[PDB]
Design a protein around this ligand. Structure first.
Ligand code: 9O1
Lengths: 227, 12
């Protein structure tokens, strides 16, 4: 069992672009130096979210075929995947223990003024992802599959997005057969993680709406990206 | 609408 040269090329373009994301030093130093309070902790979370959106757009632009889609469909895909992609990257950071600093960052997220209604399913999902011992190829492919979802709202030409997502699902299933021949349900488990990611959309949107204009968490820039 | 995302997508 091997990937075809066409599949190897598609995977290499995805892997190269995914490897470009790096946690900036100034954000890392903030986790180490800032006062441990709800206000300071949330401000660090906000900075991490704005850095991730920029990273996500750069990654998405290098996805084979993304730039060939209708300009408004590109926006619709970025808008619709922003939250899911952030939780998937957060799962990767948790299970790779980044900035390495990880226990301090976890302590800040748990004391940022965010309710346990949203924090508890968050860490439960990271633990669930951790159990699958996902390779970097799996994180990158899953991120590309989340972004290139043809059933997002406001997409005009859905079959165009389908033509881009289907070869990625083909590569991912092939990598499961190559690297886990003893576990035939590994691909099904990864799909299981995709549906769990989709639940963070409602949960995250509900969390966002709840923040009052006078609350320290109220952030107009966060609202614009996430909705 | 979505001015930040538009800028990020269209920049070089
Ligand atoms: C595992 C844990 C240690 C963690 O590591 N990196 C992040 C991360 C990754 C990208 C962007 C931003 C962040 Cl913070 C992350 C985390 O828990 N992310 C979740 C989804 C979150 C929740 C609520 C937020 C509220 C306002 C802003 C960002 C948030 C982000």
């Amino acid at each position: 069992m091997e990937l075809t040269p066409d599949q190897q090329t598609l995977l290499h373009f995805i892997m190269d672009s995914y490897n470009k994301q790096r946690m900036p030093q100034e954000i890392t130093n903030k986790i180490l130096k800032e006062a441990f309070s709800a206000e300071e902790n949330f401000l660090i979370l906000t900075e991490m979210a704005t850095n991730h959106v920029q990273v996500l757009v750069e990654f998405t632009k290098k996805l084979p075929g993304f730039q060939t889609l209708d300009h408004e469909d590109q926006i619709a895909l970025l808008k619709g995947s922003a939250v899911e992609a952030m939780f998937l990257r957060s799962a990767e950071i948790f299970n790779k223990k980044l900035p390495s600093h990880s226990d301090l960052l976890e302590a800040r997220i748990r004391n940022s003024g965010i309710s346990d209604e949203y924090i508890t399913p968050m860490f439960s999902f990271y633990k669930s992802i951790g159990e699958l011992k996902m390779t970097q190829e799996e994180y990158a492919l899953l991120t590309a599959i989340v972004i290139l979802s043809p059933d997002r709202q406001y997409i005009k030409d859905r079959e165009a997005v389908e033509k881009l997502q289907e070869p990625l699902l083909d590569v991912l299933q092939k990598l499961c057969k190559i690297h886990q021949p003893e576990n035939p349900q590994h691909f099904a488990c990864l799909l299981g993680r995709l549906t769990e990611l989709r639940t963070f959309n409602h949960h995250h949107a509900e969390m966002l709406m709840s923040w009052r204009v006078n609350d320290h968490k109220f952030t107009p820039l966060l609202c614009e990206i996430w909705d | 609408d979505h001015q930040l995302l538009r800028y990020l997508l269209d920049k070089d």
